[PDB]
Amino acid sequence: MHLTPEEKSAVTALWGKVNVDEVGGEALGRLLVVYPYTQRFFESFGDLSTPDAVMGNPKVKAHGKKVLGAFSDGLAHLDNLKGTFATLSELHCDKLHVDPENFRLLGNVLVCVLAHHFGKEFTPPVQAAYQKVVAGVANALAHKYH
C-alpha cells in the first residue's frame, strides 16, 4: 500500500465529510442492485426483489453501516491494513465463505458512491488515491484466505 503523503492527505480530508451510516447504506444497496448475484449472501435479509426494496431495506442499511464502520477504522491504520483486518479476513473466509472478488466489486461501487455525493471535488487525482485505498483494503481482507 504505497500512498504518498499528498494522497493520504487527500483521502483523509474528503473522508471527514462523509456520513458513513448513509454512505454505507448506499454502497451495500447499490452493490446488490448493480451485481444482483451478490445477493447470494443475504437471503435472510428479506425482500431484495426491486431497487426500492433493496435500497430501503432496513437490514441492508444496518449492514452497510457496519461494513463501512470497519472500513473507516481502516482509514486510521493505512500503514497496517493487513493487521487491522486480520480477524475480519478469517471470518469472511472460514465462517461466511465470501469470494474476495466481492471486496473488489464493493470497492468500485464505493468509488461511484463517493463520486455521486461529492461531484466536482472527486477530482481525478482524488479518485486515484481512493482506488489505491479500496484495492489495499480488499487485499487486506483476502490476506488470510486459505
Binding site: G29, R30, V33, V34, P51, V54, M55, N108, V111, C112, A115, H116, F118, G119, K120, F122, P124, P125, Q127, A128, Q131
Partner: protein
C-alpha cells in the same frame, strides 16, 4: 442482455449528457490514466499532460461512438462493426482495459448527474457499457 427498461434508462441518462459527452469522454480518459497507469501503455504517442488536446480530441471520439451505440441500441453489433474490426486487428487492446474505462465513465457520469444516477440507472448503464466492451472485443480471436 439489455431489457426494455435498461434501454429506456440508458437513453434517458445519455440524453441528459447531451452536448457534454466529449468533455465527459475526456474526463473519463484522464481519470483512467491516473487511476490505472498501465492503460497509458496504449497511448505513448499521445501528450497526456492535463488539458492536453489529443486527450480531448480522443474523448470526443469515444463519446461520439457511445452516442452512436445508444442511437442503435437494438442493432449494436452492426452499428459498432467498424470499431470492432479496428480494435481486434490494429489496436489490439487487452480486454481487461475495457472494464477499466467503463468504470471511469461511470464515475464521470456519477459526478456530473446526481439526480439521474439512481441505483436502477447505474445498473443499466453498467450493463450497457459491458455490452459495448463485449462487441469491441468480439473479434479478437
Amino acid at each position: 442482455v439489455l431489457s426494455p427498461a435498461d434501454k429506456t434508462n440508458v437513453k434517458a441518462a445519455w440524453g441528459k449528457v447531451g452536448a457534454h459527452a466529449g468533455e465527459y469522454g475526456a474526463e473519463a480518459l484522464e481519470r483512467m490514466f491516473l487511476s490505472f497507469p498501465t492503460t497509458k501503455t496504449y497511448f505513448p504517442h499521445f501528450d497526456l499532460s492535463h488539458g492536453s488536446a489529443q486527450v480531448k480530441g480522443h474523448g470526443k471520439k469515444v463519446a461520439d461512438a457511445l452516442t452512436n451505440a445508444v442511437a442503435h441500441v437494438d442493432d449494436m453489433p452492426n452499428a459498432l462493426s467498424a470499431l470492432s474490426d479496428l480494435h481486434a486487428h490494429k489496436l489490439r487492446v487487452d480486454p481487461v482495459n475495457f472494464k477499466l474505462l467503463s468504470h471511469c465513465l461511470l464515475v464521470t457520469l456519477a459526478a456530473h448527474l446526481p439526480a439521474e444516477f439512481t441505483p436502477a440507472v447505474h445498473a443499466s448503464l453498467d450493463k450497457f457499457l459491458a455490452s459495448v466492451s463485449t462487441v469491441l472485443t468480439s473479434k479478437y480471436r
